[PDB]
Design an enzyme around this catalytic site. Sequence first.
Site, PDB file in Angstrom:
ATOM      1  N   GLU A   1      -5.330  44.507 -31.058  1.00  0.00           N
ATOM      2  CA  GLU A   1      -5.312  43.106 -31.842  1.00  0.00           C
ATOM      3  C   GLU A   1      -4.007  42.773 -32.323  1.00  0.00           C
ATOM      4  OE1 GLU A   1      -7.761  45.961 -33.405  1.00  0.00           O
ATOM      5  OE2 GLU A   1      -5.797  47.293 -33.639  1.00  0.00           O
TER       6      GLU A   1
ATOM      7  N   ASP B   1       1.333  15.539  -2.854  1.00  0.00           N
ATOM      8  CA  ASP B   1       1.216  14.282  -2.383  1.00  0.00           C
ATOM      9  C   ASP B   1       2.549  13.533  -1.768  1.00  0.00           C
ATOM     10  OD1 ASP B   1       0.053  11.640  -2.226  1.00  0.00           O
ATOM     11  OD2 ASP B   1       1.043  11.169  -3.894  1.00  0.00           O
TER      12      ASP B   1
ATOM     13  N   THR C   1       3.545   9.887  -0.741  1.00  0.00           N
ATOM     14  CA  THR C   1       3.904   8.466  -1.544  1.00  0.00           C
ATOM     15  C   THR C   1       3.882   8.568  -3.069  1.00  0.00           C
ATOM     16  OG1 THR C   1       3.179   7.160   0.161  1.00  0.00           O
ATOM     17  CG2 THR C   1       3.472   6.178  -1.728  1.00  0.00           C
TER      18      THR C   1
ATOM     19  N   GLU D   1       7.502  -6.874   1.820  1.00  0.00           N
ATOM     20  CA  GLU D   1       8.456  -7.979   1.903  1.00  0.00           C
ATOM     21  C   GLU D   1       9.747  -7.749   0.737  1.00  0.00           C
ATOM     22  OE1 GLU D   1       5.875 -11.401   0.841  1.00  0.00           O
ATOM     23  OE2 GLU D   1       6.386 -12.223   2.843  1.00  0.00           O
TER      24      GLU D   1
ATOM     25  N   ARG E   1      -4.416 -12.974  10.677  1.00  0.00           N
ATOM     26  CA  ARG E   1      -4.870 -11.685  11.392  1.00  0.00           C
ATOM     27  C   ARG E   1      -4.764 -11.865  13.123  1.00  0.00           C
ATOM     28  NH1 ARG E   1      -8.064  -7.697  11.186  1.00  0.00           N
ATOM     29  NH2 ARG E   1      -9.795  -9.025  12.036  1.00  0.00           N
TER      30      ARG E   1
ATOM     31  N   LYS F   1       8.675 -14.045  11.121  1.00  0.00           N
ATOM     32  CA  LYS F   1       8.902 -12.611  11.042  1.00  0.00           C
ATOM     33  C   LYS F   1       7.154 -11.872  11.422  1.00  0.00           C
ATOM     34  CE  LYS F   1       7.947 -11.556   5.943  1.00  0.00           C
ATOM     35  NZ  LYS F   1       7.009 -10.861   6.092  1.00  0.00           N
TER      36      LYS F   1
ATOM     37  N   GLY G   1      -2.629  10.210   1.896  1.00  0.00           N
ATOM     38  CA  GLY G   1      -3.603   9.609   2.214  1.00  0.00           C
ATOM     39  C   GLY G   1      -3.039   8.477   3.413  1.00  0.00           C
TER      40      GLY G   1
ATOM     41  N   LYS H   1      -8.302  16.317  -0.494  1.00  0.00           N
ATOM     42  CA  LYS H   1      -7.061  17.128  -1.306  1.00  0.00           C
ATOM     43  C   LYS H   1      -7.820  18.211  -2.108  1.00  0.00           C
ATOM     44  CE  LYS H   1      -4.110  13.498  -1.515  1.00  0.00           C
ATOM     45  NZ  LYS H   1      -3.138  12.795  -2.364  1.00  0.00           N
TER      46      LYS H   1
ATOM     47  N   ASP I   1       0.938  11.777  -8.266  1.00  0.00           N
ATOM     48  CA  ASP I   1       1.039  10.995  -8.855  1.00  0.00           C
ATOM     49  C   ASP I   1      -0.143  10.036  -9.173  1.00  0.00           C
ATOM     50  OD1 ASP I   1       1.653  10.010  -6.408  1.00  0.00           O
ATOM     51  OD2 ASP I   1       2.276   8.378  -7.069  1.00  0.00           O
TER      52      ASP I   1
ATOM     53  N   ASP J   1      -5.156  11.775  -6.528  1.00  0.00           N
ATOM     54  CA  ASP J   1      -4.578  13.175  -6.634  1.00  0.00           C
ATOM     55  C   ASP J   1      -5.441  13.722  -7.682  1.00  0.00           C
ATOM     56  OD1 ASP J   1      -2.562  13.126  -4.480  1.00  0.00           O
ATOM     57  OD2 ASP J   1      -1.466  11.984  -6.176  1.00  0.00           O
TER      58      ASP J   1
ATOM     59  N   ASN K   1      -0.499  47.614 -35.397  1.00  0.00           N
ATOM     60  CA  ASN K   1      -0.614  46.943 -34.292  1.00  0.00           C
ATOM     61  C   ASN K   1      -0.342  45.366 -34.442  1.00  0.00           C
ATOM     62  OD1 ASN K   1      -1.618  49.358 -33.249  1.00  0.00           O
ATOM     63  ND2 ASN K   1      -3.897  48.715 -33.301  1.00  0.00           N
TER      64      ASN K   1
HETATM   65  N1  LIG Z   1       3.557   2.265   6.624  1.00  0.00           N
HETATM   66  C1  LIG Z   1       3.977   0.973   6.407  1.00  0.00           C
HETATM   67  N2  LIG Z   1       5.272   0.643   6.194  1.00  0.00           N
HETATM   68  C2  LIG Z   1       5.708  -0.498   6.110  1.00  0.00           C
HETATM   69  N3  LIG Z   1       4.705  -1.533   5.915  1.00  0.00           N
HETATM   70  C3  LIG Z   1       3.498  -1.393   5.994  1.00  0.00           C
HETATM   71  C4  LIG Z   1       2.990  -0.169   6.121  1.00  0.00           C
HETATM   72  N4  LIG Z   1       1.660  -0.063   6.375  1.00  0.00           N
HETATM   73  C5  LIG Z   1       1.426  -1.249   6.373  1.00  0.00           C
HETATM   74  N5  LIG Z   1       2.665  -2.108   5.996  1.00  0.00           N
HETATM   75  C6  LIG Z   1       2.530  -3.567   5.859  1.00  0.00           C
HETATM   76  O1  LIG Z   1       1.423  -3.949   4.837  1.00  0.00           O
HETATM   77  C7  LIG Z   1       0.312  -4.783   5.554  1.00  0.00           C
HETATM   78  C8  LIG Z   1      -0.856  -4.023   5.394  1.00  0.00           C
HETATM   79  O2  LIG Z   1      -1.632  -4.261   6.454  1.00  0.00           O
HETATM   80  P1  LIG Z   1      -2.797  -3.331   7.053  1.00  0.00           P
HETATM   81  O3  LIG Z   1      -4.253  -3.802   7.247  1.00  0.00           O
HETATM   82  O4  LIG Z   1      -2.561  -1.862   6.394  1.00  0.00           O
HETATM   83  O5  LIG Z   1      -2.019  -3.070   8.529  1.00  0.00           O
HETATM   84  P2  LIG Z   1      -1.306  -1.709   9.152  1.00  0.00           P
HETATM   85  O6  LIG Z   1      -0.994  -0.530   8.359  1.00  0.00           O
HETATM   86  O7  LIG Z   1      -0.402  -2.107  10.198  1.00  0.00           O
HETATM   87  C9  LIG Z   1      -2.784  -1.286  10.298  1.00  0.00           C
HETATM   88  P3  LIG Z   1      -3.531   0.463   9.917  1.00  0.00           P
HETATM   89  O8  LIG Z   1      -4.667   0.300   9.015  1.00  0.00           O
HETATM   90  O9  LIG Z   1      -4.094   1.254  11.288  1.00  0.00           O
HETATM   91  O10 LIG Z   1      -2.534   1.569   8.971  1.00  0.00           O
HETATM   92  C10 LIG Z   1       1.052  -5.266   6.831  1.00  0.00           C
HETATM   93  O11 LIG Z   1       1.327  -6.742   6.954  1.00  0.00           O
HETATM   94  C11 LIG Z   1       2.747  -6.925   7.242  1.00  0.00           C
HETATM   95  O12 LIG Z   1       3.213  -5.338   7.319  1.00  0.00           O
HETATM   96  C12 LIG Z   1       2.352  -4.520   7.167  1.00  0.00           C
HETATM   97  C13 LIG Z   1       2.595  -7.315   8.533  1.00  0.00           C
HETATM   98  N6  LIG Z   1       2.531  -6.745   9.978  1.00  0.00           N
HETATM   99  O13 LIG Z   1       2.041  -5.426   9.898  1.00  0.00           O
HETATM  100  O14 LIG Z   1       2.727  -7.360  11.028  1.00  0.00           O
HETATM  101  C14 LIG Z   1       3.407  -8.644   9.100  1.00  0.00           C
HETATM  102  C15 LIG Z   1       3.982  -9.429   7.794  1.00  0.00           C
HETATM  103  N7  LIG Z   1       4.471 -10.840   8.183  1.00  0.00           N
HETATM  104  O15 LIG Z   1       4.796 -11.784   7.362  1.00  0.00           O
HETATM  105  O16 LIG Z   1       4.566 -11.300   9.277  1.00  0.00           O
HETATM  106  C16 LIG Z   1       3.846  -9.025   6.747  1.00  0.00           C
HETATM  107  C17 LIG Z   1       3.177  -7.583   6.204  1.00  0.00           C
HETATM  108  N8  LIG Z   1       3.008  -7.521   4.662  1.00  0.00           N
HETATM  109  O17 LIG Z   1       2.684  -6.354   4.238  1.00  0.00           O
HETATM  110  O18 LIG Z   1       3.757  -8.341   3.732  1.00  0.00           O
HETATM  111 MG   LIG Z   2       1.009   9.231  -4.585  1.00  0.00          MG
END
Ligand SMILES: Nc1ncnc2c1ncn2[C@@H]1O[C@H](COP(=O)(O)OP(=O)(O)CP(=O)(O)O)[C@H]2OC3(O[C@H]21)C([N+](=O)[O-])=CC(=[N+]([O-])O)C=C3[N+](=O)[O-]
Ligand SMILES: [Mg+2]
Length: 993
Positions: A309, A351, A353, A442, A489, A515, A626, A684, A703, A707, A796
Amino acid sequence: MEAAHSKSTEECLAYFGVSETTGLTPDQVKRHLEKYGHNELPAEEGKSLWELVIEQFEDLLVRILLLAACISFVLAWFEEGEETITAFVEPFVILLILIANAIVGVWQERNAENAIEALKEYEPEMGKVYRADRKSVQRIKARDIVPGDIVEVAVGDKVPADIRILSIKSTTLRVDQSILTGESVSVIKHTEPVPDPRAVNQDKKNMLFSGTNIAAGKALGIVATTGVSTEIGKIRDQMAATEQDKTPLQQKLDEFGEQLSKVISLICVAVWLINIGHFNDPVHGGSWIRGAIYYFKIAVALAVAAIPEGLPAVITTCLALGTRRMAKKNAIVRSLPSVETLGCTSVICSDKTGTLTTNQMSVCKMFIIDKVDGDFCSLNEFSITGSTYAPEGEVLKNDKPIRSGQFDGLVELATICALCNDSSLDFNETKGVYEKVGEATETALTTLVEKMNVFNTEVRNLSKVERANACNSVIRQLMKKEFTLEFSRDRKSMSVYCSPAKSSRAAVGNKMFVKGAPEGVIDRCNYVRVGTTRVPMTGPVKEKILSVIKEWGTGRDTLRCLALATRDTPPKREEMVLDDSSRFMEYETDLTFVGVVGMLDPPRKEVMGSIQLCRDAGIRVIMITGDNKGTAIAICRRIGIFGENEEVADRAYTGREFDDLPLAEQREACRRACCFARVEPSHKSKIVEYLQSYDEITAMTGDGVNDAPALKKAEIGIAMGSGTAVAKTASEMVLADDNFSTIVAAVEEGRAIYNNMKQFIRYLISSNVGEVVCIFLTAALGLPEALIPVQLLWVNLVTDGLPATALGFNPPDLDIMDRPPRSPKEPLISGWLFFRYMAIGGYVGAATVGAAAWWFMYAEDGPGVYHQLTHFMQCTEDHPHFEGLDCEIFEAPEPMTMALSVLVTIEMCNALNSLSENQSLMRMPPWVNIWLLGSICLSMSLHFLILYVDPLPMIFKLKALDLTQWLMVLKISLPVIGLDEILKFIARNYLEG
Ligand SMILES: Nc1ncnc2c1ncn2[C@@H]1O[C@H](COP(=O)(O)OP(=O)(O)CP(=O)(O)O)[C@H]2OC3(O[C@H]21)C([N+](=O)[O-])=CC(=[N+]([O-])O)C=C3[N+](=O)[O-]
Ligand SMILES: [Mg+2]
Ligand SMILES: C/C=C(/C)C(=O)O[C@H]1C(C)=C2[C@H]([C@@H]1OC(=O)CCCCCCC)[C@@](C)(OC(C)=O)C[C@H](OC(=O)CCC)[C@@]1(O)[C@H]2OC(=O)[C@@]1(C)O
Ligand SMILES: [Cl-]
Ligand SMILES: [K+]
Ligand SMILES: [Mg+2]
């Protein structure tokens, strides 16, 4: 409709027999509501104060003392002595101690954060549906949405149910589903079927998930599941269902209670074997109501002797201090017991990201063309520093800083990144950190052209607030953006029409900036820009371009690349259809390739060295993300989880890959793989369960919402400071400063705490060991003198408590982070230490019982001389033998003080014996713990105020002078040091010899 993602929109509509144009009829809604319930998560209150307190007293060692409390009231009913009227306090004393040790438990359960409550923040109150009774869209309570009705979502909306998408009204629908993937990048849905039945959420690109929110677009869908059956509801059930196990040391204390209820309950029922003395202990009578009390008198005492105790009071103040210390190292610990469990962490799960990475997209590399002479092509490759959205970091070429203005190719690259961009960078002044506005992808470009400073704008002395977009704004001056061909697309790119607007109207030339994905963008490039000039795209040139893209898209620096191009002669604006996005690709044709940017969510800088410290401390770090397997593996190699060239085929898995393993194989995959990617939240959770099936104390660092299930299942959930409310709610500790290093700091703290905890537990138990020896010996002698049930508690609680607590401030081991994690399932006392305390236990058990016999055997003032002393219960009747002495003297004050004086002094010494196990005091100085010497004095200081301040020694009994009594307390009280020392000298030298 679970398998909706794998079926067609028509099929999904047929499943619930609903028109896409009318929706569910009133009766359908009636029946569906009855069948599927309401679209909401069940809450979890948990705490019933009554049910919680009755859970407090279900412990064994408190059930026995409780048993020993009411039984002590029976020991208040006898009326034999006048002192009895003051002896009613003795059951009352033990009871209020059972209350103290009970309140503090409730004191730690009060701050139960409700995980489900935090999680239910992600269900919106409203939802837009289409039903048969009205053509207009109805805005209804989201809990009134049933499976099968047509639902509408748009920008900002929080998805109200798990929805199969029917029609996307925008050119793209973009969803933020970090709730389920921990990734903030917006994903582009479609409506084609996803045939794989075993698809994970990351592959269900035709679904919307309750809780996720629309980043952009407007779509129409049919509800597939609601309530508990949604993806977020699976997170909920796992959070409700995960019941937290007990602490490894609490497990060691519980097995101590079970064995206590064994040896005690078998001693009292074995005293009956030596009832040979009660054959004729009365003159003619036998055993009655008054005489059998002695059997429960020795039961209530035997219970308080074994129970340590006040130990819970010691460990609780010990943990609260560690909480403070770790809170200085930026480790905010919400649960007190997890302070110790942290020291034996075998495996940290983490995790990626937002935990290991800053979760801020960064452009690592960029290249433009350098030279094109025939089949030869060269590039100017650059790199860019900075791991966050801040415009901080510089561009460099071959590891040497560089100013981009001198590269005409880089000027146009910055111009496209600033203009072909729907996003901006905000400096949050409240948080003091730059934040993104729009898409992370972007914003990476925005934060990029700020570092580049292609026009050498003076940006040093700007305000941090308007530093955000300072360099982009300069580009917006050079060209007026007229309209935007949004991303689609079919072409995987977007573009921006512009005009100059200064020198001589628009007589300088309109231009389109493009782009997108490299392959498709490059294929529509017929020329290439070399600085200012352009040359025709040729076979050798584009292969050089693609080559370096491929190298970046893979390998050690697996980046996402965007190709940057301009259309030098864009069609006339009045011959462009801006509605049909199918036409936008032919507009983005006959282009001039400029360059390529390579993107990445970088690691935090403190990580790679934190990982290595865990490695040095025998702690394995397993990434569970993920995000895509490619990216995760790439991060592990910078983090140092993997080597740069290390072969990882067998030791990284996706969730789908993991689910394909046989159950046996899944359990060992956790033992050798350090990377798991593209996982659903349950993964996970399941991986931690597998690691705990190896009796491994595992932690989980995250985060995000995704998770939370693992954050709960782990012995320790660790939440990022900047992380989600639901992750912190599910965690035992929060990293205030987001430093993964402060996990290592917390482990070293909890590591050094658990070591000192073992000491004062051993010290308290070794006391109880001897205290039980004391009572059993007295009963075998027939002498109850020299011990009281009430005296044992005070010692104690206070006399042993203060040095116990002082043992918590022991200087920790030097090479403490060079040892492997403590084994979970070994006892605090086992081999020679068992002998050491078993001997010292009986040796201090007989020093207290022998303290009485000596007083009766011989004393200057006490007493003069024999055996009939054991038969002192016969002073009453058989008086002719007990001649020369009063009958009251057998319960005299002096003999019990001696046994208490040796019990205090011995335990004052056993405390020094337990300053260290297996190291001498001539080598381990008692003054190395200045607090310990303080405690020993204050315990005896209360012992000299216990004997010399009238009420206390009235209960406890008179005090006897020094010259003739302190001589004898040192008969064993100091030899117990020598004894322990000698036994200590043995296990230290005779062991190896
Ligand atoms: N790991 C990463 N790192 C950086 N950017 C990423 C990313 N994952 C996605 N994006 C950006 O997040 C978006 C998620 O799509 P989505 O349906 O998850 O696709 P995907 O991961 O490619 C197929 P999946 O399911 O097998 O993993 C994507 O769109 C644009 O940049 C990408 C893009 N482009 O991809 O070409 C072009 C673009 N412009 O303007 O030409 C702009 C993107 N954007 O994200 O703004
Ligand atoms: Mg995270
Ligand atoms: C008074 C208390 C107890 C527990 C006790 O004595 O029983 C043994 C016993 C059951 C154990 C023993 C006790 O050994 C003795 O018999 C000591 C002498 C006293 C005999 C009783 C009559 C004179 C512990 C107490 O002995 C010493 C020398 O301390 C060590 C240890 O305890 C621990 O590891 C501490 C747990 C936090 C246990 O083997 C333990 O059994 C277990 O399962 C453990 C793992 O508990
Ligand atoms: Cl993947
Ligand atoms: K947990
Ligand atoms: Mg991807």
